[PDB]
User: Fold this.
Amino acid sequence: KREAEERRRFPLEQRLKEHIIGQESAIATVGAAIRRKENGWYDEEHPLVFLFLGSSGIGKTELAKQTAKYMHKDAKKGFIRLDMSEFQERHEVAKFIGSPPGYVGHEEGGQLTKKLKQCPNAVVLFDQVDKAHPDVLTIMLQLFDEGRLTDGKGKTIDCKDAIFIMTSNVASDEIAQHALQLRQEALEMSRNRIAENLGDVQISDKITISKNFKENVIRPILKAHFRRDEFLGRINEIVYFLPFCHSELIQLVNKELNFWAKRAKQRHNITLLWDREVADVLVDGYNVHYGARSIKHEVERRVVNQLAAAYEQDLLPGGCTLRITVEDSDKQLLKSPELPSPQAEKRLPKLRLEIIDKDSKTRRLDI
Amino acid sequence: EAEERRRFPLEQRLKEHIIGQESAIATVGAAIRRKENGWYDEEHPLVFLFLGSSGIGKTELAKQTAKYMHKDAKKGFIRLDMSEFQERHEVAKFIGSPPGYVGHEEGGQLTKKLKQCPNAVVLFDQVDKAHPDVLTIMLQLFDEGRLTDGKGKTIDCKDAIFIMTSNVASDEIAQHALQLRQEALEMSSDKITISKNFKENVIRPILKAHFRRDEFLGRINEIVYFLPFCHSELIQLVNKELNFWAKRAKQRHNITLLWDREVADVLVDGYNVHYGARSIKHEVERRVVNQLAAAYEQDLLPGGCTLRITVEDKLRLEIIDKDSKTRRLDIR
Amino acid sequence: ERRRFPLEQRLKEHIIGQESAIATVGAAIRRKENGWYDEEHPLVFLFLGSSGIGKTELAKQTAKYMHKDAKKGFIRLDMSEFQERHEVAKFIGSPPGYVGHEEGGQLTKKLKQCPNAVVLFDQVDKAHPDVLTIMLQLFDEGRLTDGKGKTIDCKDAIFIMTSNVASDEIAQHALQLRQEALEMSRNRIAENLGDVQISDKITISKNFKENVIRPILKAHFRRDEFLGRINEIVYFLPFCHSELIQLVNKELNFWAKRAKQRHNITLLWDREVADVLVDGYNVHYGARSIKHEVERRVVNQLAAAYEQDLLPGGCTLRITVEDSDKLRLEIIDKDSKTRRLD
Ligand SMILES: Nc1ncnc2c1ncn2[C@@H]1O[C@H](COP(=O)(O)OP(=O)(O)OP(=O)(O)O)[C@@H](O)[C@H]1O
Ligand SMILES: Nc1ncnc2c1ncn2[C@@H]1O[C@H](COP(=O)(O)OP(=O)(O)OP(=O)(O)O)[C@@H](O)[C@H]1O
Ligand SMILES: [Mg+2]
Ligand SMILES: [Mg+2]
Assistant:
């Protein structure tokens, strides 16, 4: 009786916003559908079927993992992860259900059948479902249709309430192009409202894909790739992951530096602080092709190796305060927005650690 | 003898010796109280089927029950392990061999044990591992409590109590308790309850897929479920294992042991959901007691001293003197 | 007796390597021998590792520690012959009315001789996973029923189980931990931090102990209460290069001792011939890859020399460095005049 009051205190939209910044339309959609499920105002005869279309490494697996962590205390048993890139051939279809009688691994059964037996209402996630040929997806047709799966032994498992989540990278380029168009148009109307000196109207930064674009391109490309309209029919909701925006990337840089500062304070009482130009240099390495993975690895290659070298060199005393700074001779290069020649090599501006003492004296560290 | 049973009900003894399982203990206590009042049907013995996961306490519950009903377990407790009876011919370990064959004069083991004590509690331990034919052998033992030996002799055990522990439908009820772990703990007395339709709509397909006979499940009087341990039950288990070791130390060499409220959290952190009370038991036995034995060899623990388990700012054993000064022990 | 020559030092002199494994085994043996062990539960150890590490020899030396004599208090069952479901009767004897009922079980008779014995289930991963229901019964309380129903108590026994499951996992993670330790050690050589004594005890991390090893044991053994009843799980790491040097030195000590007992032929060697013996080694075959290699390089040459009576007795030998990349048995004289033998 206290679960609805707890969710009234801390809804999952705030929990997911704390865990993952950006794409608040996706958060609102998954929160509303989950709220319909967990309130009880939901048709139990069919499972909750999510499809996420996104770019590479945008946080879809993190979103499903945090959803399963919110739903279940144990994510080892209450959450299932399956990589569809491995399951190219129809032979891998067998390991959903196990072999027929008379064959090898008949007593083994299916891994998925035993996994749904061990947790019938688990959050189940398949990543990159476009990699698998839809002959694999033909099992999941009836599995999303009625929640019942038949194995090789003939035991029928019934999971009518399991949240089944698909995540895919298909049509990521078209969503990226259209969302770049919408970002340019929204910046155009924002600058029009600025130039008309109208500040009474307040519009939040919520850009949502319109219906006509979806009906024009997304349903035909999904029908063409999946080659089966029936598999697209059982999907309870489609969700679009918009490509990364500037201010949320800045907030991402702030949080991925803040986590290292918090773990430094937790382990060795090391208070790390940052600069705005440090955040600019870290957000400069933004690659859409790797998604947030490129920014995270750029953060690692820039500051994590330097902080590790300072830690193993024992040059960070306990109880001290540290500041991450940009090199002085590179800020002048940052201040010049000139187009570089293609025959000149590009130099990454270095990052340094400064010690702030009790007498407000800056100490430099070079290793 | 009603005064003695009013002084010491078996629920008090069971809660004194095993923790958790407030519904299973109450169920077996209600059945044993029905036996104690003299208003059970004297033609039919009591049959129990225990459904629980690993390390929950079914075998210990049967042992403590048969310790209550009979003072000697060498006569009043007959335990047969079904791990031998994996094959169809293993049936011949209950009854005697047919006449003219090997071991015919040796007789039936279960018939001899029931003839030694007809009131004795019989524990069919781990009845998952039995062959389905052995189930049909003890079909008549549950139907009337009457078993025919290989020599033509026939033993009656209408007054006996039959306990079986099983592992077959242990996952699903645990999964059921999983939502109860997200409901009964979030209901905040508070209790963890298994729904009444569950035992007939879902559990009976597993019981029919494993035991395959309607008559075997019909002959069993009571189906007793065992629920997985909660957080407070794991706390009580940690304190019970530590109190067992402290009592053993005080009985052996007069060594007082202390643990704070904060110490039990890192011991509950050493727990497997697939395991049971034995995981917490040997985790206590390894992490704490090995340092005690190492200090006891090294003569670092004189008798009458007071020891405190402290979490590192590792479980460190600190000697507490009368002057409130902690002394760390350096173990080689 | 334990305070001067414990299990740790005798095991380290008899078996090289496996510091944490001997530490865990001797800690549990210490708590058993002090009298601070629980009487109900017999000790269950599951030994995991690659091939040629020394788990069977560790169990043999533990059994010789319990009973100074051999052949009596050491009951070893090899689960290569237990790969069928119907081999359970080999534990317990035949049921009444069937062939071999009067002979009883062999395990029952051997635990009837002595109940405090060291029982070694060797290569226990090879057994069919219905045989281990008897292991459920025996590890639960320590009692075993015969063909005639005679329940034998076994509460003073020590059960040691050796296996090869997760051998690739343990070996590959130990190789990664060795690589990372060598990287940070080479950095420490670069950083000149020699003022801190480096405790070179590479152990398996608890995340690796709990997230990959427990699922693969659950996949091979196919039961959860079985892994619950196992008290201690002891891993075995593969050797590092210093351990190979110590092992080749120990084996050459063994062969020099054998020659001294046979015809008093004192034998000597050098560091470089030990290094070229360590070069002939494979990580999969383990210490056996060392052992026969000596017989493929050294002892065959001594046997060939002794067949044509070239070593009458009392002579001193030395083994040298090959020049083909740039083994020789050399008799050294009392005047230090070496002579090569063919
Ligand atoms: N509820 C409990 N309270 C206290 N101690 C317990 C409890 N359950 C188990 N234990 C301890 O753990 C041991 C394991 O229990 P036991 O050997 O009786 O089997 P079990 O838990 O019924 O499981 P299995 O089905 O594997 O036999 C007990 O001997 C006892 O020492
Ligand atoms: N660590 C070691 N130290 C010394 N000798 C060893 C060691 N490992 C193996 N040996 C030698 O090699 C022999 C083979 O080892 P053993 O019989 O103990 O099996 P093992 O290494 O556990 O192999 P497997 O796991 O394949 O059964 C030993 O009898 C001993 O002579
Ligand atoms: Mg128990
Ligand atoms: Mg071996």
Summary: Chain C has 14 helices and eleven strands. The pocket of adenosine-5'-triphosphate (ligand 1) is lined by residues B 18-21, 54-60, 165, 167, 237, 240, 276-278, 281; C 140, 225 (CB under 6 Å).
